[PDB]
Symmetry: D2
Subunit: 460 residues, 4 copies
């Protein structure tokens, strides 16, 4: 077997040890192996996969394979691969192309290696994606391959937005399942995963004490909520910025001061609009928005000396890192940790005190400077992923008559019953015991004893 | 010579007015609507039957509706939830209100009846504001001819919405409704953070018990269960959580709570043997938050640790089997809304008996029964939504529509997201928070308008 | 119960049955105190003791009083604050035939009269021989006005930080006439009562007084000692954004590490007396200020003028002079919202507009807010403090300082704490009250760390 | 240039270590303040310090502060797993004798201490000792008493080392005076508590990447380390139970919101398996020892633990857990450095998919230093500022030069004055941007203090 490329195949044994541990931490995913192994619902599936090549993704990969699928895999970020996980998957005879520290060109090459087998397009029929890059490449560069694919399963918030924009424009070619908006994905991954892994990555990269220092979290969606908690629980004084007043209300009620980097919240492009008094007191800024340029050049110039800057959103344009590359001198402390000297562009004084510390070059800090979300959290997201692959593959969209395809081209979610069944396995993993309604109680609140227990409008 | 009211003590009116003036400073979203709409008088001609806890916060709501042109006739939706100084102030302002703290069940229904009838005949009502559905039920059961002239119902709480949706499903709902509960500035503000503030508040006022280091069991982990669990955990209780919904149970685990069931393996078969006696014997405090029936049953009550506190913060008292306790155990009143329940028998008690439970508010809503409910700055969000919902349905004029147009409009709906955000913005500004404004490039990048809405309707926050 | 008993003064004797019901509940919440009652009742270690008592006449103090009585003592009691009495507690004590002079809402004149009613019986000095005090007021009156009574008194047992400081000043000045036990500095007192008590009761009192939402609002806590630590937690756990002021850099360090921003009301921390030294921008953002220092004028007139409109002002230290309420009485108009809640209108002295927006809310007129606007610390916390009080009373009464020759007296004139072994035994009963299980050292383990299996487990230098 | 008087894992890591030292200096304002304050005075000129403490980046800033004030040093680590190899490299590259690397054997650990004691095969002309745990102190008293004759004092970092010093003093075997650095409030109530709060969950995440929220933890001990450890886990969402032999510390755990339990039925440890609360230990996902005592996670507790539980120790010595029992009876599978699965199915071999194992971190050694980087610089700032002030005080006292009659009056184990404790604290507070208020003269008079402090009596517990 030579159909792979990883950093060091001799790490496979180490990766396999950590995969065995992770399986014990992922009861929903392993429950799917046990219950669907007999049926083999993915027998004949040929999955193109593009998501962070972590130990957790390795357990997802081997679940798909255990249920009958063939896969070809790559990472969806240059810094997120765990090299021992990629080696373990390659050593199992599974095509994977990923290592930690890829270039932008190597990242694109890796995706192309899953798409192409022996210089020709693989006969893929299913797509698993995280962020929409593989989806984007298949639509623009390989649009004929999409005629054989039954569906796409997208993992993250940003990629779902890209899916919906394509549907509005009439450019989506196959059906997709929004895995993100399962409650066991969104309200488990996006929030709780960042709570675990944000402070984790900051400690590994800098070993800075967080207690008693000032943080500014930009955004208070699910990622901003978990991020703010990750810092507040360490004893940081956390301020939150938002453009959504409802999320801002939640931040107030959660015990945070809501501030704007700009005077009266008005970002008019001038240095005068920056609240320099506020930014001159901030020790740490974290972007969580999925928007562009929310930590902009004028903010970076006003930040307190020696502040830490990082991004836990999907793309590295939340921080204006291009401005910093253009104007300031970068000193690498260690991999994925750079001191950015605001004294000038060419050279720096090794003892200069006027610098910022940038983590992971503005890329996803939890995966770049640590190991991202823990297995027991990723268990929820990835159990949803397996179910969505099963559902789309059994639908067989690519084999439908043209008129039947037009009614099937949509972006749907999984039914709440499956969402609840994933949750039940996660609860049992904690040793929790769910109570069963009596028939009278179920009638009283208007549900079935079996569930679902909430209407589809419920927000939890 | 205004006499069209009944309250405990009208001489409390000046005190109530002092607290109303303070509360107004704490309710910027509600007072903003008052200032914004006062000239337009959008509720001129509205005649609102209101049934909701006659608190100081409800007083500000009432006087906002009146300031926008409405006439109202008011009662409380719970026998223990009224603040008599608030009722006095409303009555002294010439507004018909029938409510006092400590009503009997007969007085409770008499009070609702006094809003429905004026001078012994049906009032010319055309709007309903309700909390829990009791008024709504009486109208449908006893006054269908009045509903023919009513434009809509604005319902405050989860239990009342469920009752509306049952009527809609059965085809017995006679007028459209706005689900005020499911605004985010209500459900994820009032139901959650309101109970965070007021649950431990009511327990302290009722018992003055230290909570830190003691063991609590919260039944339910919806919005109220979430806020209640945090109310106890932030005080230092060791909180365990029960749930029938595995997604809510998942949240409780991830939020750092142990999830347990009162019943072995979660199976509630009705036998004493099914009770986890070891667990129940460790619990110092049980709080029910479900909106369900009999979630703290007789066998749990028998197995509870001696001197544990029992209370309910759901809408109705049947979450606890208090009927079993009246029938079997002797009740000793410590003070109003605080009773020791002696499990030694029904015929009297030893004053020094150690085997008792403490029941708060006789199982009625504990935060309102033993304290003052949610604070003004939280009820600001709920009641701003109520005002906007009243305006919307009154302006729709459902009762004046042809039969075919009524059929197209008979529904239970929520307010649009844009209103939800505008209520939130005034709440944030009340804290002194500063929302950031998107640039045109940023708004285009994420696909929203600069003024919002900022989230799809599917967003869960 | 005694026939014709009139030797008392309370608000409303008809509250007695309610008070008794709450005393019976509190007994179940105070296992260390009730354990002493059960362990020592037969021995009657306080038979012959005649105790002058001055401490907040709460339900918790009622359990302490009746423990001392159950061990053989006679007492005459008053409260140590004009607003801290629970009237149903005083009524139940009076109904039991125990002389008590206390009600909620005393004037300063009545407060002094109440202490004098304990000191006197039938117009003449009572033959007291023990003193239990909280804050030093009774101690001071005895030294200043009735020094001859101190000749027959065996000891003083002082409850709180402020009172201990007053005792230590007297000792170093040679004006202390009897030995004392510093009950405050038992760990089961200071690090339980002073910290955890305020955590429970500060937000309790603020809620009862104002019903204000605390989540999301800005608080300034002046001081970060034991009371300031517990107060800051009381507010932070509600979701307040809490800033902390301190003069002690070590306490300030703890505040930083505990997750609080440390700030001063004065620019660069320097109070030069002028309004220009006030950090007006900081104070104009504060919704709630709480004084916790035991010091004087730590929320001064210039701070009060700079506070954000409609801010809440309160004090949880022992004496009301932490806030400059005198200045507010001189210059601003007071509007009573309800008992122990006043709006203070900064528009002027004479009248006020009922809809004026420029006011502050003062709780308990600056007196101890937790006792003034709620019920102070809960029973299970006061268990620790008052168990120490009983043991201190037993130790000093059994020592019989007043019966010693003048030479032997000067050798034992001291302010002492109880030994750590007793501190530990009180803690053990508290832990058992929660259902906690303490592990027992093996002989090899106790030898390894150099302690006895039964303790004490820590050197006297240990800070916990 | 020509410097060979060291032994580190990899000298080429020096530039990386120097980069981290420069960052750490910006995080240690109290230590760097002492450098600026005393550089001209050179108060340690002539001091020759034997140092034995974790060779971390933070210790590097301490070492160079001592050198900047005039001292010469010879350094080693006090734990086989706690060295950061880039820190040791940076120190050796600056021409400072250091013998330390991560992952030493027991024989290498003792060899390293001996390399500081001896120079060119003979006793170095040492006159000061800086110790963390008492290992270097014990070797000097047992094996080099002639060297102690010329040593002016010992400055001891940690609780376990202080207890050993007090035992020597009690038995009349302590030969030179000592300063208990541990019991400065800016050490004990900063390092021991807040440091473990930061670095405990840090080390657990690095070693296992386990989700902690919603899982069950048992902390043995509720002293300073146990307090900070319990908070480290609780703030992550763990359901933390606490064990204690001290009822006062147990009272604090209760009031702090923890359930207090014992591994033994009714807390009675009689040596039998029957005494183990198996139902309690069968629900525990993580056990952490914090006591400084022996065998507080014994063999019967280990046999009863829930399958796949994590076992770690953050007290100074590994004997808090009965790891010797596990080496004799169970098969060890290394996951990665300082992470071992202990298979409870037998001693000879294991099934790679066996589910009945425990995960042991750092082989039972200090887990925060073993599996992460110990406490962060801004916390170690306080501890090491105290160390520098303690070295200055004892070196200036010149105990070794005093007559016998005067030595007897100074042979003691003391703490630093509270005024200095406060001066360290103020620099820490200023590092956060905190602003301390200055008492007026009337306010200082009212509470009976000098305006400049000290502000508390020596009995105050904070
Ligand atoms: N690193 C990870 O492990 C991880 C996991 C999940 C999601 N993500 C990524 O994180 C991002 C956020 O995801 P989410 O689920 O929280 O989405 P979300 O929509 O729930 O939250 C984003 C929030 O940012 C706010 N926002 C937008 N522009 C802003 C601005 N200029 N200033 C302040 N706030 C602003 C929005 O109002 C919104 O509340 C996405 O890119 C997603 O792909 C990362
Ligand atoms: N007291 C107040 O101030 C206040 C405020 C808002 C709502 N409420 C009332 O509280 C109740 C709950 O409202 P909500 O918004 O939280 O609703 P919700 O639907 O969000 O939560 C109720 C939860 O109870 C759970 N549950 C049902 N039966 C159960 C059982 N047998 N055991 C355990 N868990 C069980 C459900 O799974 C659900 O998650 C309603 O009656 C509502 O009207 C009271
Ligand atoms: N209300 C209650 O229930 C209760 C309970 C116990 C004690 N107390 C009282 O509270 C007060 C404090 O007691 P404690 O045990 O916390 O004492 P403490 O000595 O432990 O704390 C007081 C703190 O105030 C700080 N301080 C002094 N002057 C200051 C100033 N100008 N600005 C800022 N900080 C300043 C000191 O540095 C000190 O840390 C005393 O009066 C005590 O009697 C009240
Ligand atoms: N890893 C680190 O970074 C670090 C930092 C400081 C100290 N330490 C070490 O940690 C240890 C503890 O230090 P400390 O300052 O917390 O000491 P401490 O004296 O404050 O606390 C130890 C506690 O353990 C308790 N204990 C003793 N035997 C017990 C048993 N069998 N079961 C349960 N509890 C028991 C004692 O009652 C005491 O409260 C020492 O070895 C110290 O040197 C480590
Ligand atoms: N550990 C992980 N594996 C895969 N995708 C992730 N996204 C966040 N954390 C992740
Ligand atoms: N204060 C309050 N007023 C009215 N309704 C409420 N529901 C909960 N708290 C309330
Ligand atoms: K991970
Ligand atoms: K209220
Ligand atoms: K009380
Ligand atoms: K470190």
């Amino acid at each position: 077997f030579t159909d792979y490329k990883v950093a060091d195949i001799t790490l496979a044994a180490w990766g396999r040890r950590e995969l065995i541990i992770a399986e014990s931490e992922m009861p929903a995913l392993m429950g799917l192996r046990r219950k669907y192994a007999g049926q083999q619902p993915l027998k004949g599936a040929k999955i193109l996969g593009c998501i962070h090549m972590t130990i957790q993704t390795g357990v997802l990969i081997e679940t798909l394979v255990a249920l009958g699928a063939e896969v070809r895999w790559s990472s969806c970020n240059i810094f997120s691969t765990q090299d021992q996980a990629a080696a373990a998957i390659a050593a199992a005879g599974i095509p994977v192309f990923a290592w930690k520290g890829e270039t932008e060109e190597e990242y694109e090459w890796c995706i192309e290696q899953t798409i192409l087998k022996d210089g020709q397009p693989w006969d893929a029929n299913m797509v698993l994606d995280d962020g929409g890059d593989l989806t984007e490449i298949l639509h623009k560069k390989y649009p004929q391959m999409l005629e054989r694919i039954h569906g796409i399963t997208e993992e993250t918030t940003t990629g779902v937005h890209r899916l919906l924009d394509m549907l509005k424009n009439g450019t989506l070619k196959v059906p997709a399942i929004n895995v993100n908006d399962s409650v066991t994905k969104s309200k488990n991954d996006n929030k709780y995963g960042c709570r675990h892994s944000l402070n984790d990555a900051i400690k590994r990269g800098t070993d800075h004490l967080l207690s008693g220092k000032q943080a500014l979290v930009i955004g208070y969606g699910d990622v901003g909520k978990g991020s703010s908690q990750s810092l507040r629980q360490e004893g940081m004084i956390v301020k939150v910025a938002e453009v959504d007043p409802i999320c801002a209300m939640q931040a107030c009620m959660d015990g945070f001061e809501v501030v704007s980097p700009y005077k009266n919240g008005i970002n008019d492009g001038t240095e005068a609009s920056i609240d320099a008094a506020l930014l001159g007191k901030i020790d740490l800024i974290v972007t969580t928005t999925g928007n562009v340029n929310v930590c902009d050049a004028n903010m970076l110039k006003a930040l307190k000396k020696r502040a830490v800057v990082c991004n836990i959103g999907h793309f590295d344009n939340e921080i204006d890192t291009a401005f910093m590359r253009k104007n300031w001198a970068w000193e690498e402390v260690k991999p994925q940790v750079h001191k950015i000297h605001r004294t000038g562009k060419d050279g720096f004084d090794a003892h200069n005190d006027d610098y910022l510390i940038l983590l992971a070059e503005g890329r996803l800090v939890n995966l770049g400077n640590a190991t991202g979300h823990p297995s027991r959290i990723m268990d929820g997201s990835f159990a949803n992923q397996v179910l969505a692959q099963i559902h789309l593959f059994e639908q067989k969209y690519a084999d439908l008559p043209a008129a039947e395809k037009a009614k099937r081209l949509s972006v749907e979610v999984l039914p709440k019953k499956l969402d609840e069944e994933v949750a039940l396995e996660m609860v049992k993993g904690f040793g929790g015991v769910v109570t069963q309604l009596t028939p009278k109680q179920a009638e009283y609140i208007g549900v079935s004893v079996e569930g679902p227990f909430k209407p589809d409008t419920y927000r939890y």
